[PDB]
């Protein structure tokens, strides 16, 4: 069972930020072995913190670590562009296994924050005759890219048959992502309407389509 981290943080250059890793008393609250890892795209992780307070030779003094109870925190002072990356905490557990955080995507901020443009496409008629149905929720022009996508048939949450991409970069310095909803033609026609709710930076935008 993973140690819980916040999906994403963000900060302006020079800003100090904090990432939390919350375990149980059998891993994070039971030992001093909490360590922290930084990861860049296409590269292998590098340890920025160990034994919860300690920096490995070569690491900036801008990185500190701490533990209170079952929650250990990594703190980065004076964010510089090169700190942007994903951050994972690792802990040792009572059975002497290892466990990783769920990860945190940290964004040192290039430009001002931007909200998503959301387009929703009803299932094409070519596909309906194919005895299939799919809803396409297209997201664009947001930043930093991190998005919760949520589908609702009518007002009811739908967790069945949904695949969502990892936000990818565009040419325009903003992100983009998609979410596809698989349904049977009967499902599509049976229900009143279907909704796509994108949660970005605590704010939800929503679009809707109906037969």
């Amino acid at each position: 069972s993973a140690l819980t981290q916040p999906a994403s943080v963000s900060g302006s250059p020079g800003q100090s930020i904090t990432i939390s890793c919350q375990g149980t008393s059998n891993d994070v609250g039971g030992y001093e072995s909490v360590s922290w890892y930084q990861q860049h795209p296409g590269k292998a992780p590098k340890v920025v913190i160990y034994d919860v307070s300690k920096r490995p030779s070569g690491v900036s003094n801008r990185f500190s670590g701490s533990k209170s109870g079952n929650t250990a925190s990594l703190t980065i002072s004076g964010l510089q562009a090169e700190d942007e990356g994903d951050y994972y905490c690792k802990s040792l557990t009572s059975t002497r296994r290892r466990v990783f955080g769920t990860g945190t995507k940290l964004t040192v901020l290039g430009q001002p924050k931007a909200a998503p443009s959301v387009t929703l496409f009803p299932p094409s008629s070519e596909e309906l005759q194919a005895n299939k149905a799919t809803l396409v929720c297209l997201i664009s022009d947001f930043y930093p890219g991190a998005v919760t996508v949520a589908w609702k048939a009518d007002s009811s949450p739908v967790k069945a048959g949904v695949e969502t991409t990892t936000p990818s970069k565009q040419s325009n310095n903003k992100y983009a992502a998609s979410s596809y909803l698989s349904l049977t033609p009967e499902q599509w026609k049976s229900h009143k309407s279907y909704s796509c709710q994108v949660t970005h930076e605590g704010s939800t935008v929503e679009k809707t389509v109906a037969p």
Binding site: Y37, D86, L92, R97, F100, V136, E163, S168
Partner: protein, 216 residues
């Protein structure tokens, strides 16, 4: 330095054996790990083996299919993967446990291999099924590319004629094992019914070329 290998694209249920060759340090005196990372996901611990191989720990998700083990005379770490599952798809890293006197594990991972990929997939090389996504003073339309394997496929519009406003999104990998993606172009509402809009989908691995007309 560490180097992974043995990886590849296999079918669910098949078996595969990964090997990480080590150098530049004394191998028999240090513990080792295997860590995997799904594409676009976070890190997950797989297994750990003590320096002398007298003890080994495995993760609950990979128990009891994936077995760690080592040969100290060959300076090699192994991973034997059996009963493979679609959820086993990931990049497997050979990782070293930091150690020394007063070895004794220091409980942090100081050295990583570039990683070896493993893809467990039911799908076979297959052609894409292309369906139009129709527009309801700016209109948004596009093509839906569904059920093709493997990556990639390239999509143009009007045969590269229209490059303005085109967005081809990343493809999603469905539970079935087949890829699907969308491409949208933003056009003036007025040009609709006037200008013809066509998307060109090209799948190289299967040698499938398809052109779909997109209309109201």
């Amino acid at each position: 330095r560490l180097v992974e290998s043995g990886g590849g694209v296999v079918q669910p249920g098949s078996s595969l054996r990964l090997s990480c060759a080590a150098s530049g340090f004394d191998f028999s005196r240090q513990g080792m790990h295997w860590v995997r990372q799904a594409p676009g996901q976070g890190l997950e611990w797989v297994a750990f083996i003590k320096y002398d191989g007298s003890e080994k720990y495995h993760a609950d998700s990979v128990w009891g299919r994936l077995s760690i083990s080592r040969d100290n005379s060959k300076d090699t770490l192994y991973l034997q993967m059996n009963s493979l599952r679609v959820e086993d798809t990931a990049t497997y890293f050979c990782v070293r446990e930091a150690g020394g006197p007063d070895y004794y594990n220091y409980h942090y991972m100081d050295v990583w291999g570039k990683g070896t990929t493993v893809t467990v997939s039911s799908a076979s090389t297959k052609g894409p099924s292309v369906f139009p996504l129709a527009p309801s003073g700016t209109a948004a339309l596009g093509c839906l590319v569904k059920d093709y394997f493997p990556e990639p496929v390239t999509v143009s519009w009007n045969s590269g004629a229209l490059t303005s406003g085109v967005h081809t999104f990343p493809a999603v990998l469905q539970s079935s094992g087949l890829y699907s993606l969308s491409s949208v172009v933003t056009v003036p509402s007025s040009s609709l019914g006037t200008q013809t809009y066509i998307c060109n989908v090209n799948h190289k691995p299967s040698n499938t070329k398809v052109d779909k007309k997109v209309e109201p």
